[PDB]
Design a protein around this ligand. Structure first.
Ligand SMILES: NC(=O)c1ccc[n+]([C@@H]2O[C@H](COP(=O)([O-])OP(=O)(O)OC[C@H]3O[C@@H](n4cnc5c(N)ncnc54)[C@H](O)[C@@H]3O)[C@@H](O)[C@H]2O)c1
Ligand SMILES: NC(=O)c1ccc[n+]([C@@H]2O[C@H](COP(=O)([O-])OP(=O)(O)OC[C@H]3O[C@@H](n4cnc5c(N)ncnc54)[C@H](O)[C@@H]3O)[C@@H](O)[C@H]2O)c1
Ligand SMILES: NC(=O)c1ccc[n+]([C@@H]2O[C@H](COP(=O)([O-])OP(=O)(O)OC[C@H]3O[C@@H](n4cnc5c(N)ncnc54)[C@H](O)[C@@H]3O)[C@@H](O)[C@H]2O)c1
Ligand SMILES: NC(=O)c1ccc[n+]([C@@H]2O[C@H](COP(=O)([O-])OP(=O)(O)OC[C@H]3O[C@@H](n4cnc5c(N)ncnc54)[C@H](O)[C@@H]3O)[C@@H](O)[C@H]2O)c1
Ligand SMILES: [Zn+2]
Ligand SMILES: [Zn+2]
Ligand SMILES: [Zn+2]
Ligand SMILES: [Zn+2]
Ligand SMILES: [Zn+2]
Ligand SMILES: [Zn+2]
Ligand SMILES: [Zn+2]
Ligand SMILES: [Zn+2]
Lengths: 396, 396, 396, 396
């Protein structure tokens, strides 16, 4: 059998028995290029929280999870590179490797796996209805294209809390930093101290950044970031962000900025911080990024948000002070991360002890039975990254 | 003496006697690195029209003009590369060549020539108060860094209507196309059929584009674009832009898109087209650019527009459907063109007859006395690029 | 049945009855991801001439041909994107789409299709033993990754002489130009006026180059290059190449250079040009490329050349004046073209009439029975690109 | 007065009284855009050792030194950005900031400071005859373009052993790594464990490399590289380099390779390593770099080497196995480092404690009187980077 985390509506999730995976696409067409995995580790993301909070078009009954690490237990006949028993990291993007986007390495926007729009992902709104992987077992299509084979079992399993971050958050923070132009000696501001913002800060550090400033309103997440060796900015203070940056750096701007918040952003200041203001991060990043800088935006912005602040925000239309970014010659880089572009190199960085990602993001391993409470604690703001071990493969 | 085009407020300009240029900066500090030019050709830009329409903070008394081609008649002692008599193209950006931005080739955002913000330009709001060049004579500072020496007099003067476009519009259209990722075989949509949109289309063609579609509401400019060999889209029709693109290409999207309109954009449709809606072009480009595409934005967006449609638009804040561009993984590239990055190669393209820019943009040479009427005709929408010859150097 | 061109050693080729293609790799392992094509057009390359001249370790009995355009007449069970009857362009590289090289777009060096080294190709020495396609029928593996679907039958077949260049020579010329940094306004020197050098020149022109100088010692090919609109340099003259360039450009260097000759290069000068001197082109490109320039090298250099001038050259070791290139800060870009990187955009350039590649390279369509005489005429230096139409599909 | 290190021919150098610097170029033409520095730190380079060994056309009497850090004590009338007392890092390249190369950031090949060829440098053969700076005082031309202002006196002087590496070796190591494609998770091989190879290794580590293998035949330098945290390969062993790499990585190739040796390279193996063989490193890097990799070559190769192994090598012509590199699709990146491209970011990496460059390269501070013994110890292979403090400014 199988069981997984199901969205029930009204901010609730629950573990339920679900169908065992089949070798077919979501439209029921049998495939020979996929594998069925026994899930080793499967995480909870901020994107899942957006869905569970009712800020997307997600429907009741949705099986969640797009951050999978697992063992191949079955394979189709068009799977040349994986053997039964192999341990693999699964990119959250469902990609075919047989379309223009995939061939050009734009694996976040594959043209064939989703009938409604480009781009596919597991257990995710508007992403092709590929079943989620916060579960015991899951299907991965186009296995020879998507999967990253991990090192022999023993090496890999010792670092499983780090390697479970390769499915999404480490490559996502990395993509945010790279597309914001971070490199050796850069000064960087990362808005957001959730797991993706922390991964972006760790990635900026791995890239050689001179200093990373991580901003948030949540004081537990700021304390965590500071303890991990980053500088911080507290957006709930009345002190403007540019003054908090100037106090740390000697100038009110950074070389590079990353938005790791997205469409549920809060305003700034004692009062501002209390209310949602979806364009706040974009507007602040134009203010604090130096001229000709690049703004990397891994934070999610959607086409429909039923709980947004106004009619315009309900269809993703925000009041952005674009003239400011224009006057400073800023570039803006957005979208789902093409995880496959970076996951192999990041695996090598983890295996050679060049990054301590599980420590930086606050990995906490929980059972599948503890997933609903993990969602609740994460929603409350704890500075953790919940990693489910469904079969008690490594946390007995 | 000297005379130039002076902004008088209330949509009026007039030629007036102005001071002869001095070898000093706008703060009165003497400089040895500049030259004084006798102006050979000096054009009128859409940016000037924004100022003359009262859509910026420009003050009465402003001498206009930032598109200069001229002859060196005086030089300071820190000018090693120019000789009296040399014919030069002047980039519209005032850049020092002695700051981080300039050294990194971000010459549109020089850090030292403007006390108020990065970036300088002649006769332009918020750009360092460097005197404009729609005039008989003008100072160019940091001459060894900024100026592009043109071919020996005779060769260059035969193509002066083409070469006068190197100060701004050809490099600007080019920057729009390059930053939108145009190359050999690309399909391109250019919003705007004014001189910059036409230069972007010509630049896309020079870059090897398979096809360029130029959109506008002005039927004279669309007829011009069509006669120049481009495809067109008429935004005043009720037929949606994506359907007009699909009728030409077989799909409702292009590979690359350029915004050559900016902050006075009109809405689309029979009724829409009649009223201003500043976020219209940005929103439409996210709709018609394919996933993972790049949107190049040479069109001007400002920090303050006194005549905007609403309070938010008066400080450059627009209602942009950013969630759409995010869902499609779009990148956005903005700002003043770094003219020096591209003007030498574009000069070679002009001299070797690889681009016919004066024909494409509708160059029309006028006297300095005819500048106010040139402004009026340009404002009315004629499909021309007005080029003043102040001393009757080549149009007797 | 099937027939194809077979290499017989001692400079001879002959059309022979060969086996009908099978759905298997070169080792006999069955594959269900390939297609069998009915060959529509299939060309003869300069690489085939190196093999036929005995300048490689190609073995007697080799079926030649790696420039195929064809119609899908049989597909494996796991092919998702091709239908029977589709017309397709086949990149000359045999690539899997399932390894690190392919995922990173380095499809000229696929890691799994060739047991001996990275990189695969049809009918080619050290390329994995994939059967050549100067034949009636041919297998293409991993069809959903390699094949480029051509437009609706009719439009496509009208331009088949141009579209047949997409399998190799147009993307190759293009790769040489792009990796040499060619763009709008560039000055370019292309060494070699065979079909690949002519395609490099046409590609440089499509990229916007101001002027392309094509060098060769073969008068017919130089006259052809002139007729097609390029400048020329005749290496059989005693006039040094840099003087020839200076007479055309006013300076003895170009911005970009492309080696479209490879390891059978001749020396320069009246006497020099009569004798092989394999480092001649590499050495000359360092002399005529401007400082900080890039030298794109599509011309083939091999690890073993049994007929080379000396012991070192038989092992691919050449006396290259590297200190000159180093002193000028040159970069060198080499290898088999990754055809899939550029073929789709180049297809759109052909279909929209932006490049007349068949005319530029001198396409001459012939039957399969005329292939051996075509090889002979090509070996003698005719300025033609031989395109075989094996079933007389379009050349009746 | 002034004193500096003078090359006397026959492998000797001596400190002599030399002229005080003058505000003029090497031709005697007065300039008002330069500064005269009081030298704070000034290092000895492997390039100086090539000259002192008689392996270049350097002439007897040359004042050596191109690695200067100093205090502005006199400025020309046209210097805008430096004040008396400023502490500055001097890039080793003499660049004008006013030519095509400088504007495009190719400051290693400036077109105007050297009459004989592009590119200038202090105290260096074929570099324009700009006076060397292993001395008490030195002129720097075009000060507003070349100089990098260091942080407030106190912070800066505490880290002077690290900051003295910004003039050449840290940016050089960095350039070699970046142009070899090094980034987060890369595997890297650096040929050469002198100060530049050690700086390349430190730069690769700062860029995020998973592991760096440093090769040399000199045991002291290998032991140093190990102590500093890198992996090593000993080329004096009979064990082939690819086997040494395979023992460390599990595969006989690296993602990226850097040649930090240049034209006095030794062969490999117990016997081989005792003899000069100048193409050894180039040939070995093609063997150990993975397909489609990039080979960064900061190691010097010259147009004339009077002491080379053979006639061809005396003219910079080497028997390089180019067919191997071609077969593997390698690119080769060469030339003098454009120090200004990277020095400011590397300064911030030093100031924020992200790189411990002085420790890694083995900085040993000495007096000007000890320079000749420093040259001798360095020539004998000590694992040190000699930094002269001519006025005992920080090393009392
Ligand atoms: N692009 C991709 O591929 C991708 C992949 C993963 C997650 N995401 C998106 O990344 C974003 C972050 O994910 P997460 O897991 O870290 O989510 P999260 O909800 O745990 O973290 C967001 C953080 O932003 C903070 N925040 C709110 N307003 C702020 C403001 N004005 N300034 C600074 N911080 C502010 C919150 O307090 C919170 O700590 C989400 O939008 C998620 O959907 C994108
Ligand atoms: N970035 C730079 O360096 C730079 C340089 C030059 C000019 N500019 C800016 O470029 C823009 C164009 O300059 P120009 O000289 O061509 O100006 P212009 O005013 O002559 O042309 C703008 C055109 O846009 C059209 N337009 C309005 N709404 C439209 C819509 N929704 N879709 C399509 N077209 C629409 C107008 O009808 C008009 O023809 C201006 O904003 C100008 O300030 C920028
Ligand atoms: N990298 C790739 O993917 C790739 C693809 C196709 C072909 N190739 C190689 O491209 C090269 C050109 O292919 P082709 O079909 O045009 O070959 P070709 O043999 O028909 O043309 C080579 C031309 O070089 C000329 N030549 C010889 N010495 C010269 C010199 N010193 N200077 C200038 N010209 C000189 C010859 O006279 C000849 O016309 C060959 O080496 C071929 O193997 C590489
Ligand atoms: N491109 C630039 O801007 C630039 C700047 C500085 C120095 N350089 C050049 O960089 C090179 C290194 O400079 P350095 O100061 O470290 O010099 P160095 O002479 O102190 O070091 C070179 C090292 O290479 C070793 N070596 C010799 N043969 C070898 C082989 N086959 N494999 C590995 N190691 C081998 C030597 O034993 C020596 O330790 C020199 O050629 C120098 O001229 C270039
Ligand atoms: Zn996620
Ligand atoms: Zn796909
Ligand atoms: Zn303008
Ligand atoms: Zn500047
Ligand atoms: Zn070929
Ligand atoms: Zn492959
Ligand atoms: Zn040096
Ligand atoms: Zn220069």
């Amino acid at each position: 059998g199988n069981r997984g985390v199901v969205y029930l509506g009204s901010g609730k999730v629950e573990v339920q028995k679900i169908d065992y995976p089949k070798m077919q696409d979501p439209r029921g067409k049998k495939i020979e290029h996929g594998v069925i995995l026994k899930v080793v580790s499967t995480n909870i993301c901020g994107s899942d929280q957006h869905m569970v909070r009712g800020r997307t078009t997600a429907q009741v009954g949705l099986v969640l999870g797009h951050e999978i690490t697992g063992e191949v237990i079955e394979k189709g006949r068009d799977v040349e590179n994986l053997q039964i028993g192999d341990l693999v990291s699964v990119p959250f993007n469902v990609a075919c490797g047989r379309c223009r986007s995939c061939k050009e390495m734009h694996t976040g926007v594959c043209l064939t796996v989703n009938p409604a729009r480009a781009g596919g992902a597991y257990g995710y709104v508007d992403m092709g209805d590929w079943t989620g992987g916060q579960a015991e077992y899951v299907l991965v299509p186009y296995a020879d294209f998507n999967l990253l084979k991990l090192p022999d079992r023993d090496k890999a399993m010792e670092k499983i809390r780090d390697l479970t971050c390769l499915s999404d958050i480490l490559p996502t923070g990395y993509h945010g930093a790279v597309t914001a132009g971070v490199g050796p000696g850069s000064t960087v501001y990362v808005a957001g101290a959730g797991p993706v913002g922390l991964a972006a800060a760790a990635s900026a550090r791995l890239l050689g950044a001179a200093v990373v400033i991580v901003g948030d309103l949540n004081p537990a997440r700021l304390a965590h970031a500071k303890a991990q060796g980053f500088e911080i900015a507290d957006l709930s203070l009345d002190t403007p962000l540019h003054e908090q940056i100037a106090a740390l750096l000697g100038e009110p701007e950074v070389d590079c900025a990353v938005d790791a918040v997205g469409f549920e952003a809060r305003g700034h200041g004692h009062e501002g911080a209390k209310h949602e203001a979806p364009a706040t991060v974009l507007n602040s990043l134009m203010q604090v990024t130096r001229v000709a800088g690049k703004i990397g935006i891994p934070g999610l912005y959607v086409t429909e948000d039923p709980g947004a602040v106004d009619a315009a925000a309900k269809i993703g239309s925000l009041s952005i002070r674009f003239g400011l970014g224009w006057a400073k010659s800023h570039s803006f880089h957005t979208g789902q991360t093409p995880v496959m572009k970076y996951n192999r190199a990041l695996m090598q960085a983890i295996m050679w002890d060049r990054i301590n990602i599980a420590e930086v993001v606050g990995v906490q391993v929980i059972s599948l039975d503890d997933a609903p409470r993990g969602y609740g604690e994460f929603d409350a703001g704890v500075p953790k990254k919940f990693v489910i071990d469904p079969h008690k493969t490594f946390s007995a």
